[model samples]
Target: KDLRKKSELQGTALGNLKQIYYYNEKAKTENKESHDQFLQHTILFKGFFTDHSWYNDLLVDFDSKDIVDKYKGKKVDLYGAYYGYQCAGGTPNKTACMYGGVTLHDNNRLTEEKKVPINLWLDGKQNTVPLETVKTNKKNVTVQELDLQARRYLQEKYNLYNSDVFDGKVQRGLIVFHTSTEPSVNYDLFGAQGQYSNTLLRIYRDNKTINSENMHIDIYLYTS
Candidate 1:
C-alpha cells in the first residue's frame, strides 16, 4: 500500500511538471505575449543565496558553442522574481512568506564582466506590495489581474515607472536553470534527480532578428 501511494504521488508530480511544460510550449506557439508575460512573473533566482552570489557564481554553460560565442559581450535583460525562502532564517514553507522581489537587470553583460549589485527590486518591500493586493482580491483572482497588480504596485511605488522590463516589447524573457541541493540516485526517468543536470534557458527570440521562434539553450550549473 505504501509503495502504491508513493507511485501515485510520483505520477501526480510528474503530471504537474509536464502540464507546466505543455502550457509553456502552447503559449509560445499560440500567443507570444502570454508566454513572455508568464516568464516575466515567474521566479528566476531561487533558494538560499545572496543577490551577489546569484549574479556572480551562477554560470550558465550552453550546450552549443555557437550560442556561447554569439552572446559573448552583448547586453541581455533579465526579468523575474528573486525568491529566497531561507534568507530570513525560515524553512521553505509557503510562497507568500518567502522573501523575494520583482527584479530586473537591464543591459547586463553576457560574459567577462565582474558582478555588481544592480537595483534588483524597484520597491524594497516584499510583504506589502503584491501580498496585500493578493490578500484583498481573494475571490475570483485571475492570472491576468495578478500580473497587472504586480506591475501596478511597482509602478505606483517607484518613482521611475517609465523603465519597464515586463513591457513585452523587447525579447527579455529569462528561463533560469537553478540547481537543487538534495541528492538522489534516480537518474533514468527523472534525468539526474538531485545533482545539477542540464538546465534549460529558454530565451524568447525576436521574429525580425532571429528566425527561430524560441531559443532553448541547455545550460549546466553547479549546485549552490
Candidate 2:
C-alpha cells in the first residue's frame, strides 16, 4: 500500500461539526474497499495543521482482543474512512481511497499534498457511522506541556522508563514505549529503523512535522 493505512487518513472532527466549520463545503463521496478492515485498539495520533490540513484517528470499532492478530472483521463497523495507499504490485503509488485534500488557507493558498481528515463507515447492519462527541478531555499539551496526569497515564500504561533531568532551559526526561494503544496503528516512530526521532526535545523543536498530541502509546499483541 502507498505507505498508508486507514489510520493514515484519520479524521477526528466530529462529523456533526462539519457543516458548522465547513459551511462552504465542496464535498464528494466514494465506495468501500475489498481488503480486510483495520481495527483500532489504541490511538496516538496528534492534531495538526499540516499545510493547513488537520487529522486525528477514531475508534469506530472496538477490538474483540486488543492484539494484532488478523481481525475476523467482527466488532467491525459497516464503513470506515478510506486511506490512499499502493498495494505490492500497483503502478500508481496511491490508494483507491482519497486521503489528502485541499485545505482552506490564508489568501486561499493551496498547499502541497497533505493528509486531510475524512470520515469512515462504521461496520454494522445499517449504514451508520460513529460521530465524534463534542465532549472531549481537550487539552493542548506541548513537549514541554505534558501535564502530570497525561504523563502518568502514558508512563504507567506503556512502561515508559528513562532518566529524568532538569536542564534549566528545558526540564526534560527520556521516555520510551513499544506498540501503540491502537492495534491497527501504523506509525513512523521508534526503534533503530524508525524515522521518528521520538526523543523529547527533538519532537519539541519540530512542531510543524509533529506535535505534543502525538504520543507513542504502548500496546503488546503477545508478550512473554
Candidate 3:
C-alpha cells in the first residue's frame, strides 16, 4: 500500500512537472508573447537570506567554444521569479531562479503566491544587491520599507535593467520582484521538497530548504 501510494505520488508530481515544461515550451514557440505574458505574472516572496533567483534554460547548450564562451558571459531571458519556502540564498543566489520563462509584475500576500516580475536576460554571474545595503530602519518598519528592500534586492541582482547587455559594465539597470510570503502552495500544488538526496530537489523535494538547503546552484541548472 505504501509503495503504491509513493508511486502514485511520483506519477502525479512528474506529470505536473511535465505539464509545466511542455506548456512553457509551447508558449515559448507558438505564441511567445502569450508565454512571455504568463511569465510576467511571477510573484516574489520576501525573506532575509532568500532573495533573487535565476533560471538558465536560456543557457543554450550547443557546440563551439567561441560562441559558448561569448554566450556564457551574456545573460539569458528567465520568465519566472519565485518566492516561498527559501530554496536559494545569497545576495545573488542561484536557487530561486529557473531555466526560462517571461514577463514581470507584483503581488501582495492578498494575492496568490509566486507573483514576480520577469526581466530580460543579463549577466547571471553578476552579483545581486543585498538587502542590508538598502537603507532600512532598525527599530520599527513598515510595508514601504519592506517593499523598498525587495525592489532594491532585484536591482542588485539583474543587470539587464541597468543598461545594454553588451558592454556589461556592472550592467547599469534597475528591477525587482515583489510578492507576499503567504498564499499559494496549499493554494497551488505540490508543497516544497528538499534534502532526500545529495542533489537537493529544485521545486519538489523532501521539504523546504529553509535554513538547511544548499547545493551548487549553477551546476544543478546545467546538468539537471
Candidate 4:
C-alpha cells in the first residue's frame, strides 16, 4: 500500500518543504516571474529558516554536468544554503521531520539514482491517478502519455507560486536543493527525479491570498 517514494533517512531533521519545480523540459514554459516572486516571499519568512530557508530550484538534470563532475562515481557532499523536508502527512507519529536530513548527493555524472539507483520518491502521485498501473497487453506508455501522467503528478505535488500576489501562510521548515552546475554548460541538470542544487522548499503555515503583496525569501544549509 506504500508507493510514495521514501527512505529511512538518518540525522537531523530536514525542514518543511514546498515544491519549487517539476521535472520538465519546456522550462521557459515555467513561470519564471512567479517563481522569482515567491522566492522573495521565502527570503523574508521568519522561522527556523529565517536564517536557513531558501526559494529556488536546482540541477536542471541536463544543465548540471559540473555537479556530476564533482564526484566521479561515489556520492559527494556539499555544504550550502538549503534543507530537505521529511515526508509529510505520513508515518512516525505526528508533526515533525521524521526522515529529513542533510542531503548527500553525487557530483557531476549521470544521476546515481537512475544509474546505480538509490530511488527516493519525494512526491507521491498527484491528481489521484496512481502512476499508470500499465497494461501487460500494451507494450508501454507512449512518451505523450507519460508526459501527461507526469504533468498530472507535478501539478499537485510540485507547483511553485509565480506571481506578485502572495499565498499568505507562514511555515516552519523547508528543504534545500542545490545544483552548482550551470544551465549554460549541462542542459540536463535534474539528473535525479527532483534533486536540484540550491533548490529550496518554502513552506507556509496557512496559505492565503496576498493579492499584490510581495515577500522575500532566503535559506542556509549546515553540516553535522
Q: TM-score winner among the candidates?
A: 1
User: Which ranking of candidates, highest lDDT first?
Assistant: 3, 1, 2, 4
Expressed as tens digits, the lDDT of each residue in 1-224 for candidate 1 is 00111122234343332332222211101000111111222221222233333221112222343433333333322221222222222223321111111111232223332111111221222222332432111111112212223333333443112222433121111111111322211101122121111121111111011111111111111111
lDDT of 1 at 3: 12
- Candidate 3 per-residue lDDT over residues 83-120, each given as its tens digit: 22233333244324221222111211122222222322
Order by TM-score, highest first: 1, 3, 2, 4
Q: Per-prediction RMSD in angstroms? A: 20.7, 19.8, 21.0, 20.0
lDDT of 4 at 138: 14
Question: In model 4, how large is the Cα lDDT of residue 91?
Answer: 21
Give Cα distance to truth, residue 117, candidate 1, Å: 35
Model 1, residue pairs in steric clash? none
lDDT of 4 by residue, 1-224 (tens): 21121121111111111233233222111101111111111211112221232322321111223322322233322111232343232222221221111112322222221101011132321123242321111111112212222322333433311111232111111221211222211111111233322322211111111111111111111110
Off by over 4 Å in 3: 1-7, 11-72, 80-86, 92-95, 100-224
lDDT of 2 at 78: 19
**Looking at candidate 3, what is the lDDT of residue 71?**
24
- Find the 10 residues in a row with the least total lDDT in model 1: 27-36
Superposition error at 109 for model 2 (Å): 38
In model 3, which range of ten residues has the least summed lDDT? 215-224
- TM-scores for all candidates: the values are 0.21, 0.18, 0.19, 0.17
Residue range with the least summed lDDT across 10 consecutive positions in model 4: 204-213
